[PDB]
Each structure stands twice: as C-alpha cells, then as structure tokens.
Structure 1
C-alpha cells in the first residue's frame, strides 16, 4: 500500500498533476484530518469511541462529497485506494492503525504539494 503513496510520482503527466489537482482543493479534507488526528492522539486507549466511529463515518461522507465536487480529487481518491483504507480503518477501530492512515495521508499531501504548477 506504499505503492499507493508513491503512485503520486507515477502520476506526473504532460504539465498537470493528477489531471490538475492542487493541494488548495484538498483544504477541507486536510482540516478535518488534522482535527481528528489531534483528538485521537490525545486519546488514551486503542479502542476508539463509538462517537469517534461516527466521526470516521463523517470522514467518508466528506471524502465522497469532495470527490463529487472535483474530478481531480476524485481520481486521487479512487486510484490511491483511499476509500478501501478508510473502510478498513473504520473496521479495526484501533488507534495505531488510525495514526498509520494519518501518516500515509500526510505523506501523500506533502509529496503532492512538492509538485504544483
């Protein structure tokens, strides 16, 4: 699933990225991710709150909405396996895996931000 983190370099075509993705269009997603990263990080146990499960549900909702608004975001989310990993993280409900997803997503964001028009 790290090939999903370095697919970003395989997606530098001719020049636009992800067919015109800009990090600027990722802002709402980044904000929500940071919010719940902080909230999870302060948490003690590995078992997540049921309210936190509902929060993750709200994450998937927002991801789908953003994929609906913009096509480049849609390609980014679909081909990098974002949706299955979100579902899987919701399935295990363990803190460390949620942090693992957070590190993957942040690595994606930063590396994509390296290349922009």
Structure 2
C-alpha cells in the first residue's frame, strides 16, 4: 500500500497544502525561502534519476531525508507571541517522510519528486509568498 500513486498525487498535494496553518489575516505561514533547499535537492534528484541507476542514488535520497527532517525542525515563525513551524506542518500534512520511505526505484523517486512539484505549485497558487 503506497500513499503516492500516479492517479492521486496532485489532488493529495491540493488537500495537503489547503490544510496548512494560516495567520489570522489569512496568509500562509510557510514561505518559499524556507523550502528552497529542499526544492533544489528534489529537482537535482529528479534530474539525476533519468541518467544514473537507482543504486547510485542511494545517498542522495538519504541526504534529502535528513535535510527534510532538519528543515522541519529548524524553521520557526513567531507571530502574536505564538511560534509555529511551517516546514514541519507541511511535512506532516503532506506525509513527506512516509512517501520518502516508499522510494525504492526510479519510478517511486520520480513520483515523489513530481509530488513535491505539485505541492509547491499549489502552495504558490493559494497565495504563498517567496
């Protein structure tokens, strides 16, 4: 049983980012600067999955996972004496780590990178800031 399939990842990203925490004014707490490194690493992993075999990209996925955990744990936004952690909220509401656990070949890796594409696309669609 996989959480990401070719028939649901775009709608999954839709629902995942429509549930992200918002300020009292309605703006998203997440910004593109907080996830810029993760997006760059996902883009590079997608680029390198086309040429090289999956066994060569065994350290890149692990680096991507440790980057996801580090960024989710370190990014904090404080408004109105309340501190939220938008990257961790995005990771748990998008099931990023669980999807990363189901990466075992080129197909699943490319599906995950397309899922991240969809996540940031729809984040920008609903008023996400740079």
Report TM bin, short chain. Answer: 0.7 to 0.9
Q: Which sections of structure 1, spanning at least 5 residues, go unmatched?
A: none
Alignment partner of 1:87 is 2:87: no
User: How far apart in 2 are the matches of 1:36 and 1:58?
Assistant: 11
Q: Which sections of structure 2, spanning at least 5 residues, go unmatched?
A: 76-84
Which structure shows the higher strand fraction? 2
Alignment partner of 1:41 is 2:46: no
Runs of 4+ in structure 1 deviating by more than 6 angstroms, as ranges, are none
Does the CA-based 8 Å contact 1:4-1:81 persist in structure 2? no
Aligned to 1:63: 68
TM-score where L is the length of structure 1: 0.81
Which structure shows the higher helix fraction? 1
**Which of 110, 113, 119 is equivalent to 1:99?**
110
Q: After superposition, what is the alpha-carbon deviation per residue over 1:41-89, rounded to whole angstroms, capped at 9, x for unaligned?
A: 223x5xx11x411211111100000001111001000121111110111
Aligned to 1:116: 128
TM-score where L is the length of structure 2: 0.74
